[PDB]
Swiss-Prot record, chains A, B:
It is found in: Nucleus. Changing A308P: In MEN1; no effect on histone methylation; almost no effect on JUND-binding. Keywords: Chromatin regulator, Disease variant, DNA-binding, Nucleus, Phosphoprotein, Repressor, Transcription, Transcription regulation. Residues 213-384 are annotated as: Interaction with FANCD2. This is Menin.
Amino acid sequence: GLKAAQKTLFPLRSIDDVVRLFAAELGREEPDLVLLSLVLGFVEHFLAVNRVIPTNVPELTFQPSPAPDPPGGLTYFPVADLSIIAALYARFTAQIRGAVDLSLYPREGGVSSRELVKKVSDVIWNSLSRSYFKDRAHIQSLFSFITGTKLDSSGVAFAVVGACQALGLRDVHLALSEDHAWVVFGPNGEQTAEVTWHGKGNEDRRGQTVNAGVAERSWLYLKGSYMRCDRKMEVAFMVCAINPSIDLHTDSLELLQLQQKLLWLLYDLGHLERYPMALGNLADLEELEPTPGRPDPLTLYHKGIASAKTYYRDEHIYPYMYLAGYHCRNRNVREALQAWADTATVIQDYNYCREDEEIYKEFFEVANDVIPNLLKEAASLLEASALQDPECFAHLLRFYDGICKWEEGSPTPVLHVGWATFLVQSLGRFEGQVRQKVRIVSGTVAGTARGPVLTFQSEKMKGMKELLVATKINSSAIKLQLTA
Amino acid sequence: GLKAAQKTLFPLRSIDDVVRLFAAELGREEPDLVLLSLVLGFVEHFLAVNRVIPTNVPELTFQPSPAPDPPGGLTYFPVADLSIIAALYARFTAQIRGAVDLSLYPREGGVSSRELVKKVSDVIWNSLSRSYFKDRAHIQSLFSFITGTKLDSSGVAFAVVGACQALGLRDVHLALSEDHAWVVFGPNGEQTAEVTWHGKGNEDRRGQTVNAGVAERSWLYLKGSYMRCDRKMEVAFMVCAINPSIDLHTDSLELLQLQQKLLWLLYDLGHLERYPMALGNLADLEELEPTPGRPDPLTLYHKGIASAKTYYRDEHIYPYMYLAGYHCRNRNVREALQAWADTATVIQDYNYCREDEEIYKEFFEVANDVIPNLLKEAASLLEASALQDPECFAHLLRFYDGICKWEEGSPTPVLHVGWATFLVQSLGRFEGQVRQKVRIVSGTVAGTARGPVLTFQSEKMKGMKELLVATKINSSAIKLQLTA
Amino acid sequence: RWXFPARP
Amino acid sequence: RWXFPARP
């Protein structure tokens, strides 16, 4: 089943040997996801899931080598016998070709039927375990699917797509929003399908189209500006899905190096170009263990925002959140609040819907914890500045503005009284001398002939442009406005 | 290694056959934890962890039987071959006697050395896996320990205690507070040891004594009123540790019946008498699938509070929380708020400490979510009562009182501005006509010679006895008082 | 997934 | 344990 130009690259005995398989498979026209997944799942298993070495399995072997830092003597790596990997591969392929026969699916010249795609979906879906928790670590790979029958929400879609490549259908691809996954197929790849569940609720819309979610202007579907993958991007996804987590507090060094390396590989080949989030992931990784001759983290977060704007109508939230993070951690309040504000700038043109709970929570953390904590910390650092910069106060306001605009036209109310207390308290963190140097102008003249300035877009935030800039912050009042 | 009066009760082919082993083992003087754990772990495994039936293991067999409700035809149960169970047993015993030799531990007539106990601890602790997540489901039993080397925080202590029974030491027992576990040993069992970690942080105080935590008046250690187990109580614990959860939303019917049955068994034998929490667990279970000829849930919650008061200086929180729950779910606001108030009545004589985070969160949920939601729901049920009962308003105040008294004398502040918004909003849920029919008296004369009334114990809550009873609730004011 | 045993 | 892949 495997081609010989692949076989030869085995066996793999180090992180580097793995990279070779990826650099090499990535230079073909049709990179084998099933193969790459399996290798990745296999490695990730003995490295993160079951680190104790079996001494009674003469087929499984490990490979010694000097340990990275002065700490330690020898580290062991799971040798990927061609035999083991090829056996899994075959087993997967059998399941598929043997549970679906293309005999009855006439494909007019390189297209797949909606019945065929929904079938391959079902094949994989019914192949899934009955007894497991859908949020657990290390069930993303097909290694997982084939070995344990366990696969996580995103993993299922990846699986369906790998399955199709196995059947030869080369028009089916992974669709990736920031919090979901589905499939795109047809000529020019404009036809879509739901293949996996979303969120805690096993509520699926399998066989249905995304059209309805894009329509309702929810963030799950990114107003139609979601990623449409190609084999090369899908390989990126896979590399991003590598979970180096041994424990809630422990991480596998080798799995980190491996995932960091493989991302660069993908970067040099330019395949990260349309994947903002992957650029972020690479960023964060570097911050912790930089590699020589490579760009700074900060450089990368931006390459990420660049990508967002260019290829996705700047409609993606995470590339700001990623950057906001970096500063917040690196105690750079100014730059942090800026980026959080840029975030709300995107969110404002959406609607908060049922399935958007993930992002709701991500703002709620910023609004009600992370921010009131950088501020608290700032009120103590001057007493022993930025807490006295108006532009920072505008950043905060603009942030709240976006969040108010979001709420507008939405099914569920975003704001409730609990948001208020931390608004009131964050304002109060700024001296009235400062909260007044900010020009809250609506607009002089439009168009053009031939302190800092701030214009509100939310009717809510507009109605308070005065209360925010008082010398005494009217608690009781701001509350009753913010909620309505 | 096993006695013959046990062997004979095998093999087990139904829930009932399992109960027999427990009823029978429970009538001995020294019930075998290692045996009972293993049976329980074994059963719980093929029922909840890996439900797919292996057809290539001629040693493992399953047993058909009619399915409980009209739904379904046949249910299968994991036959517990004497062989399988005895093999595990022996393996455990080997680990222990072979990793610790009592040859060098002179026990003066039925006592164990602090060095011996700390050793058996270490034996088990070093036997533990390096790679796993400490909060995952189904790693409580020794089945887990021996099979996978995975054991959860409480599981570890249970293990240490089972290990000692294996070595013959019959003075070592399980100490159980509401959120922790450690060991008690010595003559009269007043000597104590830490054997397991607590919370997310792998921070252990192994080898150290509880004395310091009891001293600091934290809830982890219950001011010294924690349970001191005996073999019979320890068997209860085990039955309480049974996790019927197949999935975040799915539960194993058979594991529920089994755990429900085994609790009754324990109840009839009177062994639940000093275990408040177990009485609660039994309660909740019944509410969902009652058994004929057995007491009501409500009956049981009280038998539970009874036990608390009798045997533990009424210093346990959960037996109220358990009852509060029942009403809240059964939409009985009055009775609910009462019980939540009784809860704060206990908490008030403690201090909020580092490791008490579990209970903090449990109040925060009541205070800031559950309650403001019963109230919200009540403001809509009359509009189409209890929202107009002063005694309910006193319940709420007394609840907040206790929580304020708790904060007093504490390292970390309990109250912050976020608690305030839901205080203000819950007050505002009550008409001023009602908030004034409550008599907030400090005290007429003490002792005794030969609307509803409410006395505050917290200096904070006292200083506001007026603001709470205004016709207009001063938002700005209540906030600035509640936090200080 | 995991509560302390018999928690409410 | 599990984030959506590449989440922040």
